[PDB]
From a paper:
α-Methylacyl-CoA racemase in [name] ([name]) has an essential role in fatty acid metabolism and cholesterol utilization, contributing to the bacterium’s survival and persistence. It catalyses the racemization of α-methyl-branched fatty acyl-CoAs, converting the (2S)-epimer to a near racemic mixture of the (2R)- and (2S)-epimers. The enzyme enables the conversion of α-methyl-branched fatty acids derived from cholesterol metabolism into forms that can be utilized by [name] for growth and persistence within the host, a key component of [name] pathogenesis. Within each active site, the large domain contributes the catalytic residues H126 (part of α-helix 3) and D156 (part of α-helix 5), while the small domain contributes a third catalytic residue, E241 (part of α-helix 9).
Crystals of the three [name] mutants H126A, [name] and E241A were obtained using identical conditions to those used with the wild-type enzyme and diffracted to 2.45, 1.64 and 1.85 Å resolutions, respectively. The overall structures for these single mutants were very similar to those of the wild-type structure, with small root-mean-squared deviation (RMSD) differences of 0.38, 0.37 and 0.38 Å for 693 Cα atoms of the H126A, [name] and E241A mutant structures being observed, respectively. The three mutants collectively had fewer hydrogen bond interactions; within the H126A, [name] and E241A mutants, 3, 5 and 5 interactions were observed, respectively. The active site of the [name] mutant has the fewest structural changes, as the H126-and-D241 dyad is retained along with the associated hydrogen bonding interactions. Within the wild-type, the D156 side-chain is hydrogen-bonded to a PEG molecule and a water molecule (which form part of a network which terminates with Y130) and a peripheral N152 residue. Consequently, as this D156 side-chain is mutated to Ala, these interactions are lost. Interestingly, the orientation peripheral N152 residue is unaffected and can form a hydrogen bond with part of the PEG molecule compared to the wild-type and the two other mutants. The rate-against-amount of enzyme plots show the expected enzyme-dependent increase in rate, while the specific activities calculated for wild-type, H126A, [name] and E241A were 46.4, 3.2, 18.5 and 12.2 µmol.min−1.mg−1. No significant change outside the enzymatic active site was observed in the three mutants, establishing that the diminution of catalytic activity is mainly attributable to disruption of the catalytic apparatus involving key hydrogen bonding and water-mediated interactions.
Author numbering:
A (entry chain A), B (entry chain B): 1 to 39, 45 to 359
The structure:
């Protein structure tokens, strides 16, 4: 199995959202992941694993799971706190058979505290820590940024960081430990720059009125003649200048870039410029310069974009595209993911594991 | 220094956005991070660092930087590709002094390809891979989800994963390597769930008309009588039933939860219910339930929320609050971050590092 985590053994207790995503990325980087599900997937996310079946509520399944866990470097579970405990698969039980295990617990609210037994989803976790409130236009209610911020950015990615950091600690202690990755916590650290900025006057709690939330005319999308969009990210003065040039606007005729009192006027002039031609026209004008202007591609258009083609950011699968592994490693590169295959018998994995 | 990465040595070449975020989290987790800037910060992101200065364009500075790098496990750089090369700090030159070094390159477009030399920001990177198009209400142009998706979720967090993955690899190969972390790639893996779902009809390219983007009435925010908001994430039927129960809506008088043709009617009925009382009302109603109904807190209110208090998700620093380290480790816990301190002498760090 190619990639830097070749040799790592992972047991994933089947769930939804951040747990399978973390398992996926360990698999993409070369780990040997075995997912235990209840008694061929069409779900590209279940790439790079073996799937086995056991009833964990039964003496036989629990015993088979414990044998797998005994041989594993990492366990991923994403149930409510207390669930693995009552199944016989809690950290203290696993430590009995394997004190080198990294026991990685992926929740929204965390292992403890007043909400920790309450159901939730991404939207809920980013609602409680200020994030959701900060997303969207000022004249509308907050819009969810899909489940990119709680489940993945602040969820699976922090579980991964915790797993891989604990493996580093294990090299000198000779032991594992439990990683408590809560989406409410990871997402907060993900947005740490905004928490920094609020202490210095560089971020307000006022929605849709900041440098990076669409409040700034030079950091936003604009609708083009064809009803399609471009994105403008020209924060630096020189990038801003290149953008005005591409639009054919004379800077002398415009308000200063950071005259906030005249931002409505600047936005209006930029709106009128972009509206005067179709997205593809601006994509060509701005293809090479430092103007920080890009066409806003829909998913179905991405695979035709030159920078996307040349770097092989995606590969074909199941009639559609899936992203290749990231990040990229110069010496122990990952390969193209292996599709979800047929279930295997669990005793065969146990056999293979030495 | 407390946490799982105690003992790791990181050199960060001072930059903006994802590179310092990555260095911060390594420091948070106990790493010994030394940031080289140009010749006391009030930026909380520069927590858990020693800051030194060197002119990398001068013979003397190049030499001091190489001596630091010779003692390090990790180098983080976020310049345009080619920049460290021309300075004499490129991967090949570092390898001559330290072939164990994990050389972590944090860019938007990646090391190679047609855009690799072009300026950009977060909004640009997520515009070319389908992400930005997917964010926002269907009747408005796309809205940037701050810089959480490109810079951090699909940026620093992939850099971190690659650093820690390559450290794992080194434990068996004895050697380091280069990590090419491109925000355009990392963000695409971040959103894999959507790429998977597109192939099975579980996600469409139509904006604002899916399960997780505000298209679904049970997965969205709602404005309350006070003009503040709740978030509803009640996907599963039993959570949805609990949400109806709290509102006191009779399900027999409503459209079925997943009759999409009647989602306008469902939304309007939910809108009228949540608008009838203030946000804090709904916190009382839904207490201890699985309704997936939470208050949408502004940043300035977060520190008063009981679940946030009880778990010490934040700590007080400088102006306001800053997020504590995440994720959390049972045996080698991180401690409260060290503030930015005065610049120190680079020869002093070398003496420290030997």
């Amino acid at each position: 199995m190619a990639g830097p985590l070749s040799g790592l053994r992972v047991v994933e207790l089947a769930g939804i959202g951040p747990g399978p995503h973390a398992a996926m990325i360990l698999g993409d980087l070369g780990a040997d992941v075995v997912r235990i599900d209840r008694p061929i997937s069409r779900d590209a996310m279940l790439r790079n694993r073996r799937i086995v079946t056991a009833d964990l509520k039964s003496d036989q399944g629990l015993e088979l799971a414990l044998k797998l866990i005994a041989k594993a470097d990492v366990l991923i579970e994403g149930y409510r706190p207390g669930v693995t405990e009552r199944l016989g698969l809690g950290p203290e039980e696993c430590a009995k058979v394997n004190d080198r295990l990294i026991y990685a617990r992926m929740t929204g609210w965390g292992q403890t505290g007043p909400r920790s037994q309450q159901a939730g989803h991404d939207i809920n976790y980013i609602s409680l820590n200020g994030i959701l409130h900060a997303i969207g236009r000022g004249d509308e209610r907050p819009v969810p940024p899909l489940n990119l911020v709680g489940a993945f950015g602040g969820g699976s990615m922090f579980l991964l960081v915790g797993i891989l950091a604990a493996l580093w600690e294990r090299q000198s202690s000779g032991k594992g430990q439990v990683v408590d990755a809560a989406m409410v916590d990871g997402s907060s650290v993900l947005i740490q720059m905004m928490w920094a900025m609020r202490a210095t006057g560089m971020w307000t709690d006022t929605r849709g009125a900041n440098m990076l939330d669409g409040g700034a005319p030079y950091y936003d999308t604009y609708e083009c003649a064809d009803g399609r969009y471009v994105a403008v990210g020209a924060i630096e003065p020189q990038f801003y200048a290149a953008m005005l040039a591409g639009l054919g606007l004379d800077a002398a005729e415009l308000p200063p870039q950071n005259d906030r009192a005249r931002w409505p006027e600047l936005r209006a002039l930029l709106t009128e410029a972009f509206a005067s031609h179709d997205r593809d026209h601006w994509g060509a004008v701005f293809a090479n310069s430092d103007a920080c202007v890009t066409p806003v591609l829909a998913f179905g258009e991405v695979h035709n974009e030159p920078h996307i083609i040349e770097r092989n950011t995606f590969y074909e699968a199941n009639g559609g595209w899936q992203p290749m592994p990231a990040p990229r490693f110069s010496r122990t590169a990952s390969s193209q993911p292996r599709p979800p295959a047929a279930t295997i018998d669990i005793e065969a994995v146990l056999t293979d594991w030495d």
